[PDB]
Amino acid sequence: ACDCRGDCFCG
C-alpha cells in the first residue's frame, strides 16, 4: 500500500 512511509510503500 502507500500510506505509512517506509513500510506501506508503493514503489
What's the β-strand tally? 0
Distance between the termini: 9 Å
What fraction, in percent, of the residue positions are helical? Answer: under 10%
Inertia-based shape: globular
DSSP strand content: under 5%
The profile of the biggest β sheet is: none
Number of separate helices: 0
| Content-based structural category | little secondary structure
Rounded radius of gyration (Å): 5 Å
PDB class: cell adhesion
Keywords: Double S-S bonds, type I beta-turn, cell adhesion
Assembly: monomeric
Entry title: solution structure of an RGD peptide isomer-A
Please supply descriptive tags for the structure shown above:
11 residues; little secondary structure
Structure in words:
The chain has 11 residues and is largely without helices or strands. It is 0% helix and 0% strand. The protein contains no helices and no strands. The radius of gyration is 5 Å and the shape is globular.
Quickly describe the structure:
0% of the residues lie in helices and 0% in strands. By secondary structure, it is mostly loops.
Helix/strand layout:
Layout: no helix or strand
PDB class: cell adhesion
Keywords: Double S-S bonds, type I beta-turn, cell adhesion
Assembly: monomeric
